[PDB]
Design a protein around this ligand. Structure first.
Ligand SMILES: [Cl-]
Ligand SMILES: [Zn+2]
Ligand SMILES: [Zn+2]
Length: 406
C-alpha cells in the first residue's frame, strides 16, 4: 500500500511552531498558542479532538546583581521565590556543594556552587541543610544561555538559580549578591488528543502516536521537539485514509520539558479498561536534526529490551530497506509513563552512530529550523509510519524521567 509521507508538510509545521510562534515554554502563552495550532491541524485531518488541561508547578523568574554587575539567570522549577524587595546576603563559596564543603560560615549566606559531580538537587539540599538563604549554581561549561538547575521533581525551601560560567567566576570574588525571584502561580499546560476510531469494533486495542510540543527557555525548539510533533501530525494525515480495527490516538504532549508532566498526567487518567486495551506507544522526539554526524535512528526503551514497538520497527525496516536502526536503552521522553503503566513503548530519536549522542544545538537558541534536515524527517517519517502501519493494518528513576539534572 501507498504511504505518501511528505516531509515538506512536516517542515512547514516546524516553521509554524519554531519561527511563527518561537520558543514554547510549558505553561506560557506560546505553548497555549501552539496547542490551538495543533488542535486545528488535527481536526482538519478529521480526528476526534479533545484538549486535556492539567496543572503544573509555579513558574519562577527574576534578577541577580552583585557590585555593579547584572547577571542573567534561570530559576529552578519547584523552588522558592524571594520577597519583592529581594534577598541580599553574603556570598559563601561552597565549591561543588558536598555537605563537607559547607563550613558553619555558610549559615545565613547565599551558597554559590559550581556545576558538576553532584546532582543540582543534592547541591541545593546540602546548601539548605547548612543554613543557606539561597543557592546560585553556575555552569562549568561555555554557553549562550544560563544553565537550568533542574531539581528533578523535588521541592526546595530556598531560592535556587542557575547562571553562565563566567558570571559565576566573577561571583566567587564578590562579598554579597541581591536576588529577586517571583513565583507565577496557577500555571497550566495541556495535551492535544486526536482519535481515529473504528466505527464498528467494540473495545478496540489502542495505539498511541505521541510527541511533545513544548521546549526549553530560549530554544525555538525546532528539533526538540517541533520535529516530532510535526512528523506525528503528518503521519496522522497519511493514516487518515487507512482502514483499521485499532483505535489510534495521536497526541501532542505538553510540558514534557518539566519532567514528562503531560504524558504522566495523561497515562494516569487512563481508566483500567483503557489500560488493558492499550497495545503500543510510538513516541517521536528529535527526529529531524541536520547534524551530519547523527545518522543512526535509535529506538529507546526504558529497559533496553525489545517489545512490540521494536518488533514492528525492525520489520518495517526490512520492508523499506533501512540499515541504520538500533534498539537501545533510554528514558527521558513521553514513552516513559506508558512503560511504567505496562504498555509497550519506545522513543524514536536520531543519534551519532559512534557515541549515540545528540547534536550540540539541543536545548540552545541554535535549535532552529536552520538545522532541520528535510531528508532526515523523511527517513524517520517513512520508518515510523511503516512501523505504525504494521501495527494498525488489517517505576523509573529521576535520570530516566528528567533532562539536564546535573
Ligand atoms: Cl519535496
Ligand atoms: Zn524532547
Ligand atoms: Zn528536551
Amino acid at each position: 500500500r501507498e504511504l505518501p509521507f511528505k516531509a515538506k508538510h512536516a517542515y512547514s509545521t516546524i516553521s509554524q511552531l519554531s519561527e511563527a510562534i518561537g520558543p514554547r515554554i510549558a505553561g506560557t502563552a506560546a505553548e497555549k498558542k501552539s496547542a490551538l495550532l495543533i488542535a486545528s491541524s488535527m481536526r482538519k485531518l478529521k480526528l476526534d479532538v479533545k484538549v486535556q488541561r492539567f496543572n503544573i508547578p509555579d513558574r519562577l523568574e527574576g534578577t541577580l546583581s552583585s557590585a555593579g554587575r547584572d547577571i542573567l539567570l534561570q530559576a529552578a522549577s519547584g523552588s522558592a521565590p524571594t520577597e519583592e524587595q529581594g534577598l541580599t546576603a553574603p556570598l559563601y563559596n561552597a565549591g561543588l556543594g558536598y555537605q563537607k564543603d559547607f563550613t558553619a560560615d555558610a549559615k545565613g549566606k547565599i551558597a554559590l556552587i559550581s556545576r558538576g559531580d553532584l546532582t543540582y538537587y543534592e547541591k541545593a539540599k546540602n546548601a539548605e541543610a547548612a543554613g543557606a538563604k539561597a543557592v546560585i549554581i553556575y555552569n562549568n561549561k561555555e554557553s549562550l544561555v544560563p544553565m537550568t538547575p533542574n531539581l528533578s521533581g523535588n521541592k526546595v525551601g530556598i531560592p535556587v538559580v542557575g547562571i553562565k560560567k563566567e558570571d559565576g567566576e566573577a561571583l566567587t570574588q564578590q562579598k554579597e549578591a541581591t536576588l529577586k525571584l517571583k513565583a507565577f502561580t496557577n500555571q497550566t499546560s495541556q495535551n492535544i488528543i486526536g482519535i481515529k476510531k473504528p466505527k464498528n469494533i467494540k473495545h478496540p486495542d489502542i495505539v498511541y502516536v505521541t510527541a511533545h510540543y513544548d521546549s526549553v527557555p530560549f530554544s525555538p525548539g525546532a528539533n526538540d521537539n517541533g520535529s516530532g510533533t510535526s512528523v506525528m501530525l503528518e503521519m496522522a494525515r497519511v493514516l487518515k485514509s487507512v482502514p483499521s480495527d485499532k483505535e489510534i490516538r495521536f497526541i501532542a504532549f505538553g510540558a514534557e520539558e518539566l519532567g514528562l508532566l503531560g504524558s504522566s498526567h495523561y497515562v494516569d487518567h487512563l481508566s483500567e479498561k483503557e489500560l488493558k486495551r492499550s497495545e503500543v506507544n510510538f513516541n517521536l522526539d528529535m527526529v529531524g536534526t541536520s547534524w551530519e554526524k547523527a545518522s543512526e535512528l535509535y529506538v529507546n526503551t526504558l529497559d533496553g529490551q525489545s517489545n512490540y514497538v521494536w518488533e514492528s520497527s525492525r520489520t518495517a525496516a526490512e520492508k523499506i530497506g533501512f540499515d541504520s536502526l538500533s534498539l537501545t536503552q533510554g528514558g527521558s521522553s513521553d514513552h516513559v509513563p506508558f512503560h511504567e503503566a505496562g504498555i509497550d513503548s519506545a522513543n524514536f530519536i536520531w543519534g551519532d552512530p559512534e557515541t549515540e549522542e545528540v547534536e550540540p544545538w539541543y536545548h540552545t537558541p541554535e535549535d532552529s529550523i536552520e538545522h532541520i534536515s528535510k531528508e532526515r524527517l523523511q527517513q524517520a517519517g517513512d520508518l515510523v509510519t511503516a512501523a505504525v502501519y504494521e501495527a494498525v493494518k488489517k517505576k523509573a528513576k529521576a535520570s530516566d524521567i528528567f533532562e539536564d539534572i546535573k
